Amino acid sequence: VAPTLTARLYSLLFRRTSTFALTIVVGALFFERAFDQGADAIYEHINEGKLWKHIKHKYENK
Amino acid sequence: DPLTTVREQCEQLEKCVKARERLELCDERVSSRSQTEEDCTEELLDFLHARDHCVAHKLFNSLK
Amino acid sequence: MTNIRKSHPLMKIVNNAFIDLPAPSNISSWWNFGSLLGICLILQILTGLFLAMHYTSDTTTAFSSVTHICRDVNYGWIIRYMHANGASMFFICLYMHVGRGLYYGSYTFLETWNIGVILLLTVMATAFMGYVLPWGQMSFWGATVITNLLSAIPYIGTNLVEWIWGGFSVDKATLTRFFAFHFILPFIIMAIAMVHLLFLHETGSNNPTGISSDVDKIPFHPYYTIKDILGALLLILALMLLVLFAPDLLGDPDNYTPANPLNTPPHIKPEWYFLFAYAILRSIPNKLGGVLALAFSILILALIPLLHTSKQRSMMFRPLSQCLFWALVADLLTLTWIGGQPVEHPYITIGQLASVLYFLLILVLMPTAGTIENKLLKW
C-alpha cells in the first residue's frame, strides 16, 4: 500500500499550518504564471491577427 | 461597390416584395391638395427596416 | 478568564458579534443581502476615495476629470466603472434586503427597521449626488428637475431651492456641494449601519417559518462566515460580469455629453433605482401633490409595522399575502418600466393605475388579506 495522492500531500504539506501557508504562498506564485500564460494564449488565439501583437510587422524596421 | 449590390438582393425577398406595395401606392397615391400630413415617411421606414435587417448579415461577409 | 483573546481586550469582545453570535439555523439565502449590503458600502467607499483621488469638482473640468480617470490613469477605468456599476448592485441588494423585511415581517423589529428606512433614504441621497459628479447632460438636467421639484412647497420652496443650489441655476456652487456631500455622507452612513447592527443584536434574526429559533441556534462563525463569503463571491461575480462585459449596459444613460445648460433630454429620468418614485410622481397632475406622493412612496415603509394585521409575522404560511406581495413586486416592476417611457397617453394611464395599485397593495389590500387569513384559520 501507498498513501492516496491526497494523503501523501496531506502528511507532507498540510499537517503543519506553517507548511500549509508556505505551500499556498508558492502555489499562489506558480499558479498566477500558468494561469496568465494559458489564459492569455487562449484569449489571443480568439482574435488572431486582430491585436497589435499580431500586427506590429507591417511598419517595423523597414 | 459592395454595399450597393447587397441592398438590392435584400429587397428581392418575398417579404420585401410584399411590403414594397405600401411604398409604391403612397409614392403616387397622394391627391391634388397634397396634404403635407400625407408625408410618405411611415411607409418608407417599414421598407427600409426589412431591407437593412437583411443587408447587415450578408453585407458583412463582403468587406475587409 | 485568562488569555481568552476575545474577552481579554474589551474591543475584541465587541467583535465576537460575528463569531459566537447565536444565528438561526433555517435561513433563506435572502439573508446575505445584509452582509452584501455592507460589502457594497465598503466597496463604494474604497473605489470612491480612489476616484476622488483624481477627480476635480468644477464645471470646466469635471467631465474632463472623469474622462481622464478612465483614460490616462492606470486602472482608473475599471475603478470608475466598478464604482458606477457598484451603485447598481448596492441598490439591487437594497431592494432585496427590504423585500425580505416585508415578506417575513422582520420589521417587527420596530427600532431596527426604522434605522433601515433612514439608511435606505441616506443611500438614495448619495446616489443622487454622485451621479451629478461627472456633470453629464443627464446628470445636469436631472439635478435641476429634481431639486426644482422641491420648489413645489408654497411659502418656502422657492427660497429653499435657491439655497440648496447656492445660486439661480446649477453652476459651480451646486457641483462643488454635491462632491462634498457625496464624500462625507457614506461615512455618516457607516455609523448608522453600525447603530442598525447594534439594535438587531438584541433580538436576533427572524426566519422563513416566522417562529422563534432559540431552540435551534447555531454559532455564526463555523457556518455563516462561509455562507457570507460565498455570497460575496456571487455578489462580486455579478458586479464584474456587468463591469467587464456590459459596462454601461445597466447604466441606461448614454449621455456622455458634457452638459449644455440649454438642451433637450428627450426623456430625462433617474437611473433604474429611482424610476418607481418617478413614475409615482408623474401620475399626479399637480406638482405639489406629486412631491408629497413621491415622499410617501418611500416613507410609507415607516408605517408598515402599524399596518400589520396578522398573527403570523411570517407571510410564509399565508397564501393570499404571498400573492399580493408578489403583485406589488411586479407592480413595482411595472412602475420602473414606466420610468423610461415617453410622457404619453398609454404610459400615463398605465402608470396612474400602477400608482393606485401600489398604495392599495400596501395601504388597504394586504391588511384586509391579513384579517381574512386570520379568520380562515379561526385565529
Binding site: L9, F14, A28, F31 | - | -
Partner: protein, 49 residues
Amino acid sequence: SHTDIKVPDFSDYRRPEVLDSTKSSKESSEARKGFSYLVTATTTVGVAY
C-alpha cells in the same frame, strides 16, 4: 431505558472510504482530511491571485 438507544443509519451520508461497518478508518481517513484541506488550499491560492 437509556440503553434502548441506537445511533441512526448514517450509511447514506457517509462515504466510500469510511463506510465499512467492520474495519478501521484510521488508515482510511488520512487522505480524507487531505482532500478536504486540498480544496481549501486551492481556494486560498486562487483567491490570492
